[PDB]
Write a protein that binds this ligand. Structure first.
Ligand code: HEC
Length: 104
């Protein structure tokens, strides 16, 4: 994937709702401390819907690569929406970047 690439794709589109290199808190949006890690519903104490809260999927490509296209697509029972990096190539950059971004 890419680091500086998805580093700009992330801080440009999911930066106000997904924190990874800034801290990983539930700021205006949920951080990515659950990305590529087997666990999806990180700390449900945030506001996940009735699925990501204590979900059971993962966040590699097909899991993210799918989500990224359209949030509700992976789980329309979610409570977030944003169709920005739905293209594809850049999408991958987003994942890889994050993989080591929130690995701080
Ligand atoms: C707020 C306006 C959001 C933006 C912008 C993006 N996401 Fe989102 N995402 C949001 C919420 C609130 C949730 C959790 C469900 C809920 O109802 O609270 C999510 C979920 C994800 C997930 C899965 C959750 C997990 O445990 O990992 C992923 C993988 C995810 N979001 C990715 C993602 C990306 C790549 C975004 C930018 C292209 C993005 N989200 C925007 C809130 C918001």
């Amino acid at each position: 994937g890419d680091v500086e690439k998805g580093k700009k794709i992330f801080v440009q589109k999911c930066a106000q709702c997904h924190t990874v290199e800034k801290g990983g808190k539930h700021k205006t949006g949920p951080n990515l401390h659950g990305l590529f890690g087997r666990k999806t519903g990180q700390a449900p104490g945030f506001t996940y819907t009735d699925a990501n809260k204590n979900k059971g999927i993962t966040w590699k490509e097909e899991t993210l690569m799918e989500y990224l296209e359209n949030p509700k697509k992976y789980i329309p029972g979610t409570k977030m929406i944003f169709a920005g990096i739905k293209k594809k190539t850049e999408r991958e950059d987003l994942i890889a970047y994050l993989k080591k971004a929130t690995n701080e």
